[PDB]
């Protein structure tokens, strides 16, 4: 069945297939009367193109290889970066695959020295503050009781 079998009517030219330069991608003579003479002509013209490229072929190919090698070495493709873990992931039993759950579910303590220094500083500050006489403080419980008694 074609697309009209739905009974619908309209209300590679895709922009992807088109480039401002070279126009639309894709050879216009991809298929046609191809025979032994056509193959010979294509071989001759390809040989001519290769001969033309021979002008700087060695240095151009050397620079291309060096550039691509350095580009791959500097920036690795993400698949290359994860290939190591992908290959290390092969060593797994098929029984463990069924076991994958869902998401429904010496050494020094660093806090102790900080607490000790903080307590030392607090003790020093309290020792200094004991010389201060004018500080005021009320009895929390006592004040509260009075509040209690004050409730109408």
């Amino acid at each position: 069945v074609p697309g009209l079998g739905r009974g619908a009517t309209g209300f590679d030219l895709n922009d992807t297939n088109y480039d401002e330069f070279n126009g639309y991608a894709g050879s216009l003579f991809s298929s046609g009367p191809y025979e032994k003479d056509d193959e010979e002509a294509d071989a001759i013209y390809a040989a001519l193109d290769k001969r033309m490229d021979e002008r700087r072929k060695e240095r151009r190919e050397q620079r291309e290889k060096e550039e691509i090698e350095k580009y791959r070495m500097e920036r690795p493709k993400i698949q290359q970066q994860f290939s190591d873990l992908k290959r290390k992931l092969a060593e797994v039993t098929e029984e463990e695959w069924l076991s994958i759950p869902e998401v429904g579910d010496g050494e020094l303590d660093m806090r102790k020295i900080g607490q000790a220094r903080n307590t030392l500083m607090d003790m020093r500050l309290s020792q200094v503050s004991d010389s201060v006489s004018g500080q005021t403080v009320v009895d929390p419980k006592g004040y509260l009781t009075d509040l209690n008694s004050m409730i109408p």
């Binding site: 619908a8 030219l13 895709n14 922009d15």
Partner: protein, 141 residues
């Protein structure tokens, strides 16, 4: 990834459009590798289950299914197509053409509102519906 179901031939498409009677059929024509299609499909997966009650999403590859290219003017790298009870719904986005989105919005709420408006207009009976937003200006400042 692309957990959204895919249609591999025109037959799958033309019985998928007729499969849903109470839900809006959404078809993304394009290519997975296409980045813009990648953005839209990420947005769709972000809201694939939110609109399960009244909408369905299918992904169609242009290369795999090229029969709709001529009839639907599928010349953009990506298009989004809305159907209901075998009838296409045009959406007035303000972009000039009302038949297809033809662009990838990053905000999933915009697509949710668009599909909700399309459903509301399709169940009521209007073939052309007005987008509850103007996309002529990108609203960038």
């Amino acid at each position: 990834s692309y957990m959204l179901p895919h249609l591999h031939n025109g037959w799958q498409v033309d019985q998928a459009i007729l499969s849903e009677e109470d839900r809006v059929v959404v078809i993304r024509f394009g290519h997975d590798w296409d980045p813009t299609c990648m953005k839209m499909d990420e947005v769709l997966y972000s809201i694939a289950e939110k609109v399960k009650n009244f909408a369905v999403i299918y992904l169609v590859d242009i290369t795999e299914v090229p029969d709709f290219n001529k009839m639907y003017e599928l010349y953009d790298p990506c298009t989004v197509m809305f159907f209901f009870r075998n009838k296409h719904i045009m959406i007035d986005l303000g972009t000039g053409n009302n038949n297809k989105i033809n662009w990838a919005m990053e905000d999933k709420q915009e697509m949710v509102d668009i599909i909700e408006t399309v459903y509301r207009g399709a169940r009521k009976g209007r073939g052309l519906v007005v987008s509850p937003k103007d996309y002529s200006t990108k609203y960038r400042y």
